[PDB]
Amino acid sequence: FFGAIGCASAIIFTSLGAAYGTAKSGVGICATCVLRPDLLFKNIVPVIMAGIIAIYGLVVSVLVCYSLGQKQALYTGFIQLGAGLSVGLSGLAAGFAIGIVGDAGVRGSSQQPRLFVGMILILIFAEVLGLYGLIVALLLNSRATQDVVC
Amino acid sequence: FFGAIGCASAIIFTSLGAAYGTAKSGVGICATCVLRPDLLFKNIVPVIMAGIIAIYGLVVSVLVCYSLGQKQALYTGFIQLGAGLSVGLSGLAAGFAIGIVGDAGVRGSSQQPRLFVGMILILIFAEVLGLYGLIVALLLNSRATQDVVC
Amino acid sequence: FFGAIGCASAIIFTSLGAAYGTAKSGVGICATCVLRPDLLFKNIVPVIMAGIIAIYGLVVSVLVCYSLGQKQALYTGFIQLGAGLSVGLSGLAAGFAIGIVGDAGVRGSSQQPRLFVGMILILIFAEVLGLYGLIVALLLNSRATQDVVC
Amino acid sequence: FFGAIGCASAIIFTSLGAAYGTAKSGVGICATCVLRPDLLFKNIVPVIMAGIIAIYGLVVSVLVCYSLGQKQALYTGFIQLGAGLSVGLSGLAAGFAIGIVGDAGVRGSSQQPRLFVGMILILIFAEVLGLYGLIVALLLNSRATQDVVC
Amino acid sequence: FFGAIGCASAIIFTSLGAAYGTAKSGVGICATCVLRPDLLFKNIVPVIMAGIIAIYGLVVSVLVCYSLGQKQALYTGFIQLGAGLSVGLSGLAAGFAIGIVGDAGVRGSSQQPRLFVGMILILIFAEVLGLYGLIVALLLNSRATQDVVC
Amino acid sequence: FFGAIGCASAIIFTSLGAAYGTAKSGVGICATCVLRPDLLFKNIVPVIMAGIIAIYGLVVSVLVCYSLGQKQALYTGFIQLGAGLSVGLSGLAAGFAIGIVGDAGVRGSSQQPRLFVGMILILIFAEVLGLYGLIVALLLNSRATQDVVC
Amino acid sequence: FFGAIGCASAIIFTSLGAAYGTAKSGVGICATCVLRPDLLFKNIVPVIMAGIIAIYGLVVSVLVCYSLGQKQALYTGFIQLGAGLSVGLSGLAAGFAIGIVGDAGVRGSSQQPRLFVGMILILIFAEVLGLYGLIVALLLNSRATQDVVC
Amino acid sequence: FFGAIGCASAIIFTSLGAAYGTAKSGVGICATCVLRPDLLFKNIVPVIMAGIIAIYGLVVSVLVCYSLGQKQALYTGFIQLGAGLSVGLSGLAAGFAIGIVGDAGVRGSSQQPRLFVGMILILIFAEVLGLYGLIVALLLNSRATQDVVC
Amino acid sequence: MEGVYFNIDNGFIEGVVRGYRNGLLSNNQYINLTQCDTLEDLKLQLSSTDYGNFLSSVSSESLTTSLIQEYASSKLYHEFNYIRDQSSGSTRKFMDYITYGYMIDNVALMITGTIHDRDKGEILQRCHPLGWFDTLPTLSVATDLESLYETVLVDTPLAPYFKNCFDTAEELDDMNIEIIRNKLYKAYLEDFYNFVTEEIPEPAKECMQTLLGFEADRRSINIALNSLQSSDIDPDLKSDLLPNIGKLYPLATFHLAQAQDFEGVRAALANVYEYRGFLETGNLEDHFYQLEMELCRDAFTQQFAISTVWAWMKSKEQEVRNITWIAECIAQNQRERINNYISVY
Amino acid sequence: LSKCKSELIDAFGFLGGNAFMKDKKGKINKQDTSLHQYASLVDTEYEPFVMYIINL
Known part of the structure; x- marks a missing residue:
């Protein structure tokens, strides 16, 4: 419902962020490694750090998906939606930071x-x-499951 | 319905991801080819990486097809739509990264x-x-039909 | 009826992809030909590659046209419409990549x-x-004509 | 009502196409005729190639005119709309390719x-x-047309 | 209603295109003439060309004016409408290509x-x-009220 | 109704057109004149071409006032509107053309x-x-007022 | 209702026009004073010219306000609006012309x-x-005063 | 009510107006002051010139405050709304012009x-x-004041 | 791609540029000019071309070194200075902007020239938006840093030279002639890349864009050759702007520039470039010009593009150099040396 | 001057040569390569009869 677009948000926005992240660092990485090959090992750590944000996203999503009932209310929808959103866009912005640095x-x-x-x-x-x-997203998920309450 | 627009969304967003990947990778490839003519084998494999994203995009779409309702609900539609987005923009983002790097x-x-x-x-x-x-998209499709048209 | 627009959308956006493919490719070919004119034979094999997307787009349109009738159910319209989007815009994106490379x-x-x-x-x-x-549009379409139900 | 929009779309987008095609190619010609004053016959053929799109246009536009109802049906109306689209934006895509090239x-x-x-x-x-x-239009239009009063 | 706006369309758009054509050729002619007083007679000929676009546009407008009324059928309205756009947007684009070349x-x-x-x-x-x-706009005028508007 | 908007419309477009003209020509005139101080009379003949557009507009606009009452038909309205467009578009288009030349x-x-x-x-x-x-505006105007019929 | 917006068009638009004229003029004059320091007095005479349009704009508005009722009539309303537009936009446009030149x-x-x-x-x-x-604004106004009665 | 939206227009737009004036003049005075320190006193007069407008606007807002009561009707509402408009947007424009000169x-x-x-x-x-x-704003404000229909 | 935009201004600017190309020297003419040894004969032949008019305007019984500059400087006034009056919009600012990049190097040489006590009429032809009759003179005579800033402000749009003159005050470009010129060359390229960024979304650049890359490596290589068998400073920028750091690196540019005859890095880098590790300075020079010459010619038939005009502006600099260089040799009754190769390129 | 010169060229030019008299009104001057030359230095077209024009 409004849960399903929460789930989408979570895995989608955290992925956009990490992509950018990887991309930028990647240009820099690729250049430096073929001039000095002992700096291969140093390189590895920026790129994968931005990778793990997405995996927390994936988890949150599974919860909302499973928590969807039968013709849930508009009020119920928004509480589920809100959890999904919190992990996705916080992910996007962490992704931005990790790549620029x-x-x-x-x-x-x-x-x-x-x-x-x-x-x-x-x-x-x-x-x-x-x-x-x-954190916030989890507290929201558990409660978010009401299953019709206007 | 909106279930149909789910399929639509999957195949379009993931085509854009893959397209970007192939485009960009290609420019690099073409350039490198004048500087050394023995690297063709190495050069081509990056492209086929972004080529596996599209295939993933197909299994979701077929899945959604089969799972379509009898006339659907505003809610049924949304579970299916939301799944199309998840596979589609996760693809757009994975495909963008492959091409810069x-x-x-x-x-x-x-x-x-x-x-x-x-x-x-x-x-x-x-x-x-x-x-x-x-993965998330799969689960959503399976939910959509359950509850005997949500 | 929205299926009619389906037919329309597939064959317009897909054509625009081939249009793009050729426009970009052309500029690269016309430049190559004056520098070294013996590469003609090679130069021509890429351009016609963008011309093949459109050709699948017409087939979908013709098939659908006869099954549209004069009047049809609402549900049927919306699946025929979404089907039409899938090929249209994927067509569009495939043409852009082909025109840069x-x-x-x-x-x-x-x-x-x-x-x-x-x-x-x-x-x-x-x-x-x-x-x-x-592939996926074609399956939507055939199943969708039943006057409600896909 | 919606039949009028079919008429326009047809006759507008196809003109525009041709305009682009003719305009751009035209510039190219003018320049070569004062760098080389003997290539006159060769140059002239590319420019005039566009605008033939327009003649296919005139047929479908003229059909929809006669059939432009006093009051139009929805089901009938949208097929009449879609019908215009198909010749027009295809004419546009053709034109755009041809002018660049x-x-x-x-x-x-x-x-x-x-x-x-x-x-x-x-x-x-x-x-x-x-x-x-x-082609595609031809097919939608045939059905869609039922003369005056759809 | 739709007649009033039908009138409006032909006269606006075809005028703009002509304004453009004349203007842009104009800049070029002023430059050429000081550098070459001899070829004045030739130079002049391109600008005069875009004035005749407006005249065909105008013929349609006057015709629509006479059929105008809200005291007549929807059919009179809609036919005025389609006639307007038909010459209106093609004039506009004709104006562009004449002005560029x-x-x-x-x-x-x-x-x-x-x-x-x-x-x-x-x-x-x-x-x-x-x-x-x-062509198309004229015939729409004849359709709206018979024998080229009496 | 719409007839007031006809009046209103006329003063906006035709003002803007003339503005754009007198500005463009002006910068060129003022700049050019340092070289030769005996180009006064010549300089002016551009600028007055556009000064008469606005005043033609004025004859039309005033007529529409007197004819605009406390309440009148829809019919009178749509036809006034259209009289207003006519002067509006000429003012707009002629002003822009003149200022470039x-x-x-x-x-x-x-x-x-x-x-x-x-x-x-x-x-x-x-x-x-x-x-x-x-011309067109005046003709529309005279016709406009005849009242009656939704 | 419509009266307040009547106020808005006149007092915003002519104020921005005048402001631009002054602004531009200023720059030119402020630049010039270093080369030639006695021609100030003549320059200033064009500058102050566009501010007196605004004092007119503001007179048009104050009338419309007091002259507004709560009874509502669309026809009466549009005339109040349509009058403000005319001095607002004519004012904007004068203001642009005099500052450029x-x-x-x-x-x-x-x-x-x-x-x-x-x-x-x-x-x-x-x-x-x-x-x-x-001129046009004054006449419309005089009708418009009636207290938006039907 | 609608008056509170009026009060905002006056206090917001005039503040933006002056802010710009302070900004633009200021950056220039800061440069001038290190190469010519004796002209400080003089430079201080262009910036403070923009300042005097802002105090006008504020006077109005404080007025409007006293003038609301705690409830207002639609007729009263609109006269204050439109009233507020005048010093804010004219002020906004005047403040902008003075910052540039x-x-x-x-x-x-x-x-x-x-x-x-x-x-x-x-x-x-x-x-x-x-x-x-x-001035204009002030007069309107004063008549407006009575509340729940003026 | 391009031509998707409707522009009145571009219409004139493209036609006028194309108008000059048409009268320009052909292959046949270059062959004809090399042959000569008579002063009078050169005059006669040159007259047909676009440059030929200026020769005809004032003629003499003997051709001097002085006359040849004066003709070329006159031609720039027509091609460049005049066109801006008849233009406006974004199209004009581009004509202004590329000229200002030339202006940066040229004025800095003028300023230095004042210290040595060279004259303002002793400054030789170079593209500008105002010739020597206005802005260039006012700048030339002033030796103080402050007065230079004031002169740039009068111009519209503001020229990069404000930033450059601030730098050289703080001694970020150093004292010596060499060092300043090299850093200012990087400044030139820095501003060129920024002008490309603004202009690209409406008219797409193809031939120009490849040419802007090729010019970047090419320039770093010209400074590297110049300061070879002399001295190069490693923390100072004399490695110039490069397109990518994986195309060629700052390091390899700087080694190449240092005095050890370590040409081999150039050769490794060059796999389809016409420059390659050579100890012959002259052979390299021939190759940098031919290379620079190409991708200009493909533009000249490509049209309704901002791309076209850019490539022409740098092409006119190369055409002036070549025409004056052939003309000079015949004046002083010499046969073309390195010049012969670059005539037809 | 022009119309005068033309009436002379047509009247007397025949003596110089049958093909060497062309109609000209105004001084024709050529100086492009060695394919077109006009001067007493070098020429490849000139006046067929002996004529100098004196203007102050």
């Missing part, structure tokens, strides 16, 4: 083979957003 | 074909975005 | 005449994008 | 007058697009 | 007087669009 | 005073349009 | 002080619209 | 100390719209 961090990697850990830290501040949505 | 990767191949294999592994990380949506 | 490979041809055939191979991958979409 | 081909001609047959050849690929729209 | 034809005069005739030739083909709308 | 025609004056008369010929071709609106 | 004319004043008044004559020519608006 | 004028100031007043004369011309507006 990631790309400049690939330049950091090349010049500083020792400050590998510092670059990682910048990325990690964008992952709190994903957490912020996921 | 793809493109930059063929400059990678030009300088060093040995760590080409390294770039493939980046490419595979974009495909999971498509998968998570493909 | 088409362009890029003729520029490849001028400078070095060796991996010309690889350029061609990329175009053929976008033709899948039209096919799969086309 | 048209302008670009006079460059082929200017620098070498040996591949003159090959420039034309790019155009012809796009003209089949105008044809397919008409 | 027109501007370019001033250079064609200056470097070769002799193949000035090639310039004219291209223009004479763009004029078919005025004709195509006008 | 004039701007460019000052470069014509400066270098060659002897071919001023050829510049005039251009300017007189744009004045046609003003007339075709004014 | 005005700005270009300060380069004219700069070199050729003596013949400054020739620039004024061209500039002043767009004041007519403001007048045109006033 | 003001800025460009500081560079005039810079090169010729003496003619600071000549720039000031240009600024005051734009103020007439703001004053005039204010």
